[PDB]
Every structure is written in C-alpha cells, then in structure tokens.
Design a protein around this ligand. Sequence first.
Ligand SMILES: CC(=O)N[C@@H]1[C@@H](O)[C@H](O)[C@@H](CO)O[C@H]1O
Ligand SMILES: CC(=O)N[C@@H]1[C@@H](O)[C@H](O)[C@@H](CO)O[C@H]1O
Ligand SMILES: CC(=O)N[C@@H]1[C@@H](O)[C@H](O)[C@@H](CO)O[C@H]1O
Ligand SMILES: CC(=O)N[C@@H]1[C@@H](O)[C@H](O)[C@@H](CO)O[C@H]1O
Ligand SMILES: CC(=O)N[C@@H]1[C@@H](O)[C@H](O)[C@@H](CO)O[C@H]1O
Ligand SMILES: CC(=O)N[C@@H]1[C@@H](O)[C@H](O)[C@@H](CO)O[C@H]1O
Lengths: 247, 247, 261, 261
Amino acid sequence: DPIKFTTGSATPASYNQFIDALRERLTGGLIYGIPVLRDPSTVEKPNQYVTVELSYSDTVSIQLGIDLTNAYVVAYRAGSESFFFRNAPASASTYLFTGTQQYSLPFDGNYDDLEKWAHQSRQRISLGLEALRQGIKFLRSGASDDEEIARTLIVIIQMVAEAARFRYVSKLVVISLSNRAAFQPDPSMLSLENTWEPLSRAVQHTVQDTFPQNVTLINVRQERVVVSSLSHPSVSALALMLFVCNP
Amino acid sequence: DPIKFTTGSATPASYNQFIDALRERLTGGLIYGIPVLRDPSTVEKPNQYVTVELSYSDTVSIQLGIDLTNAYVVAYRAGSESFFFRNAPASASTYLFTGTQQYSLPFDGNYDDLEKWAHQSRQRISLGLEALRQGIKFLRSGASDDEEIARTLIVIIQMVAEAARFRYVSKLVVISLSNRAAFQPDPSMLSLENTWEPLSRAVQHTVQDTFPQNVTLINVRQERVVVSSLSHPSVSALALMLFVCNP
Amino acid sequence: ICSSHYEPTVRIGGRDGLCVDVSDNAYNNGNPIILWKCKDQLEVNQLWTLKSDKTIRSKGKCLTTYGYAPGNYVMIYDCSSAVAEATYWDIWDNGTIINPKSGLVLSAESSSMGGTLTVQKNDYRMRQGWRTGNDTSPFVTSIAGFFKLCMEAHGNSMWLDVCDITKEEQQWAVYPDGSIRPVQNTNNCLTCEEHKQGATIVMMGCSNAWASQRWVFKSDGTIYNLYDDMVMDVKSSDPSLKQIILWPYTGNANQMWATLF
Amino acid sequence: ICSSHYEPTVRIGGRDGLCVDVSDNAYNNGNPIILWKCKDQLEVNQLWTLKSDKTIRSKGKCLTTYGYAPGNYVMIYDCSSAVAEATYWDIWDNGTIINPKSGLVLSAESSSMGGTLTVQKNDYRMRQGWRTGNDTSPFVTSIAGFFKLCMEAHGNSMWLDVCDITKEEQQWAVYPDGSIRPVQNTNNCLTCEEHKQGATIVMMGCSNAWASQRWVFKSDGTIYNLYDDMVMDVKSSDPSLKQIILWPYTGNANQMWATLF
Ligand SMILES: CC(=O)N[C@@H]1[C@@H](O)[C@H](O)[C@@H](CO)O[C@H]1O
Ligand SMILES: CC(=O)N[C@@H]1[C@@H](O)[C@H](O)[C@@H](CO)O[C@H]1O
Ligand SMILES: CC(=O)N[C@@H]1[C@@H](O)[C@H](O)[C@@H](CO)O[C@H]1O
Ligand SMILES: CC(=O)N[C@@H]1[C@@H](O)[C@H](O)[C@@H](CO)O[C@H]1O
Ligand SMILES: CC(=O)N[C@@H]1[C@@H](O)[C@H](O)[C@@H](CO)O[C@H]1O
Ligand SMILES: CC(=O)N[C@@H]1[C@@H](O)[C@H](O)[C@@H](CO)O[C@H]1O
C-alpha cells in the first residue's frame, strides 16, 4: 500500500532505499543466492497486487499497480480515476484501486505495444529524474493524449519495474541523478529487459554451475556475450528472478 | 568568444546571468524601450558571428555559432570537428570555427526541417536541464545519428536562442530548473517562436501606440489573443526584436 | 525607415473593459461620446481610425473636446466645422490619450455604462487608462514571480506560490484600463495599501478606479506604476512572508515578472 | 520442480583465459590433460559434456585424477576401466572444480600453454578458478562504484572517477579464472597489497595467479574474495583518497558495485 518514492527531495541515496524496499516486497525466496519472485500458485488473487506511490509535490501523486508476479505494472491510479492496461486480468480490476472510476487504456502492457502506441522505440525515449517528475505531473493532470500516456508509461516502468530487476538499471538511473543528465537505454540495458524470463529460467535449471541453454546478451558495443554459467560476472546484473521452478 | 553557460553547477540564478549576458551581446539598440538586434547592413561579415560555449564537465563541451542577426544558430563545434546547417551561408563557414574540420548536416536550420529530420514535432520533444546536459554529452561524443542530432539541436536552440528572445521561454526554463522536471512547449510558447518576425515588425511600425496589423497569438488553452497595441501586456513577452526599420 | 502611410482603425477599450462609443449611433455635431458595453461584432459607432493628422475618427467625424477645462466633455463633431486644435489627440505608449493643447487627458469618470467621457487633469487614474484595438477582452494570464513562483489570490490579499496552471487562484485578467483582476472576483483590482515606498499590495474595489490600481507590464520586466513611479517587489526577496510591496526599481531578480499566458 | 534430464556440453576456461584440452587430440587412457590456447572454432578435444553421474567427458572418455595426492595429474581415461571415484567431479557456483573423495581441486600450475593440470589443495588460487562454457572470451566491462563513479586504472594502482564510457582506463576484462584485468595491460590483475583487513588493492602480476587476485562478482552486489572472505570497499566512503580496500562485508553503499557492460 504505501511503498512510495517522493521525487521531490530525491537523492541517489533516496532512490535506492526505495528500489531496495520494493525488491524486498517482491522477493519471494532465494535461488542460488538470487532473489526469486513467488510461485503464482502460492499467491491468492486478493493478495496478488502491490501499490507504489510516486509523488511529485503532495498535492500531486499517482499510484501504480504492481502484480506481485512480475513485477509487471497492471495499472495506475491518478486521483479519483484509475486506468488499466487492456490485458490486465479480471483480478487486477476487482482487487485494485477499488472505490475509483476504472477505465482501460487501448494498449497492451508489453513494450512492443506501448512503443507501437508512442510512435517511438524504447531507445529514443529518454530517462532521468526530471523526466519522471514530468511524468507524474502529466499523468496526474488527466489529459487524454494516448500518444503521451504510452511514452510516459515507458519511462516509469523502466525507472521502476525494470529498476527492480536489474542492478544494471538501478545504476544507470542513479548515475543520471548524480550526473543530472538524462539517458536513453543502450544495447546493454535493452538486452536485460528483453531477456529476463529466459535468464531467470537458466539460473534455476543450473546444474554443474552451467546453464542448459546459452543466454545471449548484447554489450554496449553491440557484440554478443554468450553466458552459459551461473559463475559469469554478468549473471550478477540480475536482482530479481521471475519464478520458473524449484531445485 | 567566451559567452558560456556551465551546466555543471546550474542554478536559476546561474542560468539567467547567462541569457542576460547573451541578450546583452545581441542587443544592437532600443526601439520603444525594447532591445532590437542590429541592422544586417550595419555589420560586416567578419564581425557577424558569436560563440556560445555550453559545457557539461570540462572535458566536455560544445560551442555554438550564433549569427548576430538572428540569433539564429548556424553551426556547432564539438572538439576538432564543426558542423554547419545546410543553409548557413559562405560567411559562417569561412569566419567561424576555423582551424577545424567542417562538415554540413543534411538539414536546414528552421524548425519545419529539423522536425522533419527528428521524425517528431517540436511539441513532443521535452525540455529541461538534464535534457540539455544529455545534449551536450551526446553532440560531444561524436556519434552520427542524424535523427538524434536534429532532436538534440531542437532542445538547444529553444533553451538558448528562443530563450534569448522571449522572456516567456527564459521562465519556462527557469521553472524547470527550480522544479527539476522537464516540460514540452505549450501553444503559448510555440506562438512566440512562430511569430517573432511579424511581432518584431509590429512594435517598430507602431504609431498611435497601435500596430498597423493585428498579431495573433495563442494562449495555453488554444484561444486567440489578438494584439493590436504596443500597450498590450503580452508585448512584454518580447525581449529581443529582429531589426526591421528605424522610426 | 518605417513608413507612416498607415492609418489603422481600431475600437478602444478602457475603464472596466468597456468600449469608446458614439451615443446611440448618432453623429450630429455635439453628440456626447460615451463608454458603452463592447458590442458583440464590430459596428461603426465603436470603430476609430487613428489618422496621420493626429485626429481620431468614427464614420469620418472627429473625437472632440467641448472645451479645454478639466471636466468638459468629448463629443462627435464634423472635423472641419470643429476647432482645429480641439480635435488633435496623442496616445502614449504608457496608455494615456492626451490632448496636446489642453494638456488634459481622456477619462471615464462614472461607473454606469451610460457614462460620458471628459478631459481631465492627468493623475494616471485607472479610469484615464486605455488600450487599442479590436480585441477588447481582458488578457487572461498567469503572472510568474521569481523562479518556480506565481501570484496566487486568496480573498483580499495575494502572495506567491508554486506555479500551477491547474489552480484558478493563479489566473488573472488584465483589463484595457491597466487594472489586474483575479478571474475569480473581477470586481477586485490589485491596489496599493497606500501611495508609500512600503505598501504592501492588497486587493481592493475597482469601484474606485484610482491611480493606485493601474499597472504597466513594462518591457524591462517589471510591473510598474506610473503614478508612484515604483514597481512590484517581493519584500526582502523572502517569499515566506506572503507580502509583495511597492518599491523603487533595483532590477534584481525579486522585482522581475513574467506573463505566462 | 526443475528437471535434470539435461546434460550440457561446454568447453572450460580458466587460468589466463586458456582452455581445458585433450593433449594433441589423442585419447589413449593415461594421456595428460593440458591447458592450451582456446582454439578458434569448437573442436572435440576441447569440449566437455557434464553428465548426470557427476563425470566430465570429452569424446566419451573421462576426466580423471591419476591419484588422490596433491600434485598428481589429471588425464584422459576410459571411464569404465577407470577407478570409480577418481572420475567423479563437482563444480561449485563459486567457480572451483573439486574431486569429492580426494577433496583436492583442479588447478593449472604453470604459465606455459603446454601446462598439465593437477589436483591440488584448495587455496582458492586464481589458478584453481574455472568458468564454463563455449564463449571463453574474457568479459569486457566497466565496474561502477558509488553513484556517478567507476574504477579507472592508472599504471599500477586504481581509484574511482566519474563514469565515462569513452575513457579506456575504465574498461576491464574479467577472465574465466576470476582475475580482473585492465584492457590496457591484460598482464596486470587487481590484487591485495596483502591478505589484511586493510589493504588497499593494487595492480600486480598475474604471473603469480594467487588467491589474492581471484574475485567473485557476488549476487549481493559485492566484489568478493573467497580466500580472504572480504570484499572490495571504498576507504571511508570518501573517494577523494584514491583508495579501495579489502574489508569485511557491511552492505553499505560503499561496498556495492555494478557491472556496466
Ligand atoms: C543456432 C543458435 O542460435 N545457437 C547458439 C550457438 O550458436 C552457440 O554456440 C551456443 C553457445 O554459444 O548457444 C546456442 O544457443
Ligand atoms: C481575415 C483575417 O485573418 N484578418 C484578421 C481579422 O479577422 C481580425 O479582426 C483583425 C483584428 O482582430 O486582424 C486581422 O488580421
Ligand atoms: C473594413 C473595415 O471597416 N473593417 C475593419 C478593418 O479594416 C480594421 O483593420 C480592423 C482592425 O484591424 O477592424 C475592422 O472591423
Ligand atoms: C524626453 C521627454 O521629455 N519626453 C517625454 C517622456 O519622457 C514622456 O513620459 C513621454 C510619454 O509618456 O512623452 C514625452 O513628453
Ligand atoms: C552438437 C555438438 O556437439 N555441438 C555443441 C552443442 O551441442 C553444445 O550445446 C554447445 C554448447 O552449448 O557447443 C557445441 O559445440
Ligand atoms: C551448509 C554447508 O556446509 N554447505 C557447503 C557450503 O557452505 C560451501 O561453501 C558450498 C560451495 O562452496 O558447498 C557446501 O559444502
């Protein structure tokens, strides 16, 4: 309910404390000394969602609906109205932001659909603090410009849900804050985003400290890093695994 | 030569001091208690350009070529290379960023061409500090992505040349800094940008404190403000007039 | 060298956002010039060509003082039959319409729509304030203070708060007469507690249409008052105080303002 | 419940980024297992299936200790003809390959390409370090420190500076053996001044392949050293000092690191 980042008074220190505290809530168990999420067959529907508050001023704040599952972001509430992605299931709608008026955005909540709607690839859309504060402000003053609602959603998910998963995304953010300059995700970040499931499953099937299928990442200079081992440095980039099986 | 904004250590105080000091250099005379630029028939070609430095770190900085005329931005230098718009005249090229290697961008330096190249209207492209520091960093680490070079040029021109002209653009910027949140220009800003020439000429032809042709602006809520008087509040938005005639 | 072939024709707004008007649309020499409602579309009895010769004309006749004594009325008179100098006028970039010879200035001296105009002494009254032409509507806008800061309006006084376009309290209407009025109660005007180096701008009744209610959005970036020769200033550059004060020009950040329309 | 039908087959990298190898591509029982150059494409004498039974196989024969005494060599032997327990192996998530019965661990004891492997006592030497499979290339990446901060490398020591992907000095190659090496002089390794609560990480010769040069990128976000049981830490959380020191785990921001590849 109250896991909230105040964007007013943000510091690198401040922002971390948050992401941590979130990973915390999402953290279902440990597998090989990596935080795995919960078995969706261990969680009941009324228990399934989490609420993150992003505040601008105070006044001025929007909530997010986080599936406990993923870790995905099913919905966001802006005042006495809330909005859900066109593929949230019936559960999100009945068990979340109740007491509000509930509308459905015309887009899925994967990227290749949000991008479709934003008319702009993930990699041209800039990330930073000022850009997130611009997002809270926007989404709050409820102006139906779908084109934007997508764009600004992309910003948030990344700087929050993707932040939760990859230690690599947390830093990139923290670096922006300390630098006070925006950044767009490089090949290295997009990989991690695009490869969370398959990497999650690798870690978990691991036997002689070896992945049974090579996970292939891309490094800043568009070269392939092909990871077959739990012992690999890169594997450390992963801070939150989707649950796939117990060993 | 050295009129430079350090973006490291930027404050509202800091940023102003700059814009001022620039308007200063551009300021050719006063007409009805408004700063007019110089008569392009009063300036010789070797005297025609100004250099603004935008620094990120130090290291890390790019220069701009400002026509003294407009007030326009003919070119920018990033290290031992400099780049000019495809419509800068022969003068900019011979008299500016000499001692450098000089290339030409494939775009005009009006907006409707930069926008064409950025695949994005002026009004979707966000402004702020972090976004300008992202721009300096980018343009400096010389990566030929025209699509971006346009986008990031649009940011700079606005936050610098448009800032110089309209007291309205300075504030919007200063508000971002103090707020630490990005903004996109509203109808009100785009107007002033799009109506600088015709408003400049109005002010100057003014007789009984009356414009001989009604200048028509747009206010935040897309309504028309139609200005026929030097005495109008709005007229105050203008901080720098292009020269059109002496009275 | 800006030519002056041009002779534009505009209506004229003023006290309370009313229009300068030819009574009933009648033109017989001598007919009083009144201050009516600004009619819906552009009629002749409200339009005024501002001629080269320095005369001001509706339907080809002249805007004319009856005589040169403060309290005499302006009327419509056929310009040739009219006394030469009594028909010349001069509009200042500061928004007053003076008559050269008389030294007197055009002013709207009563509340009523049916009010007549008069030449008066120049005291820079809100009522002596004017603003040409065509679009008479007050200028709805937000005044920005320092960094991050805008005038907000609470009942009677006004202070600064964080600029928010959502808030209504931050929205102002500047009227052709130079008054600034909160779009909430357009019957208030920003006013000086008194004509002192210290006041402390309050909100008061435009019933009065005083000198201390007529403001200039001057192009040095100050909000200026031509009777006091003083500007609007934010106490000790400390805004926690909820006080804005009339003070002489320094030019420091605290005295500077932006129309964020 | 993750099934274990799976039996993958990978090459194995290790000391100096070399490969585990079947000498000359010959398989006669008894033939020494060497540490050759990691051949261009994937040959059989370099590939290893990691079987369910806990044996490690190239071309169907077994990775085998000659005997259970520290300093005996590993060889290729036909697994059935081979002594049962001498052919079982265990790879730890910490990157060591132990032999259960012997308690000894696989290690590459000389510099030369032509080097033979041996079971040794487990001292967590850079030379006892290993990393499966297929892509043996060291992992070229930038290590990020605090906020805004990355390891930069100047000749012999190393400190933190502002993260810049342009700078070469901020680029590191992590090798299958667990060494961290500046892409400038890949003959250096990050090393502990000494095995003390205080050192002060320097850069030294990987000629040595010591315990104090083998680092773990551990998933709590620390850079850990399994012989010292201590991590890499930024003196008093003050970076002006140009000092990074081996210290016990606190978990504070100063001890945390990011691979920015
Ligand atoms: C055809 C294909 O895509 N398979 C790749 C292979 O090329 C690679 O050698 C191996 C380990 O690097 O990972 C596999 O998934
Ligand atoms: C046809 C046209 O665009 N002309 C406009 C007119 O509509 C308007 O009344 C006048 C003053 O408002 O300004 C003119 O330029
Ligand atoms: C033709 C005519 O009488 N109409 C006038 C026009 O000429 C004038 O310029 C305008 C204000 O700019 O107001 C219109 O109503
Ligand atoms: C130099 C001079 O004496 N000129 C004055 C000016 O200062 C005055 O305020 C202005 C319009 O308001 O008209 C003139 O009479
Ligand atoms: C068919 C074969 O022998 N080739 C192997 C492949 O099966 C293995 O999985 C891969 C590492 O993942 O290395 C290849 O060279
Ligand atoms: C609880 C226990 O004693 N298990 C140990 C573990 O702590 C050790 O470090 C690991 C791999 O390195 O293997 C086991 O022998």
